[PDB]
């Protein structure tokens, strides 16, 4: 679904980076979180 | 002075105006700040 991410739109659900700034949204981040929310809707997730 | 402000360059010294971002430096507040404390300097600062 990261791949599906749009071009220039924030996604609704976002992992921020610390920046000189401040907190700003990072792509990877957001990218590797909702990765994970894939996995866990489609195959579970595991708190053992 | 704050004429003589440097340009591209923060003062040491400046006010920050709020944004969608979050505060940032604002080269207007930061000039008046900047006026009021030369003439605080200059003819000094009153409180009556």
Same mark, same amino acid.
Not at 10 to 20: C, E, M, N, S, V
Not at 22 to 32: A, I, P, Q, T
Not at 38 to 44: P, Q, Y
């Given at each position: 679904?990261s ?5 220039? /739109? ?6 921020? *980076? &610390? /920046? ?6 990072? *792509? &990877? ?6 990765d ?13």
């Open positions: 679904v791949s599906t991410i749009p071009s220039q /739109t924030i996604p609704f659900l976002h992992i921020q *980076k &610390k /920046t000189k700034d401040g907190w700003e949204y990072n *792509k &990877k981040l957001s990218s590797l979180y909702l994970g929310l894939e996995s866990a809707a489609i195959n579970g997730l595991t708190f053992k």
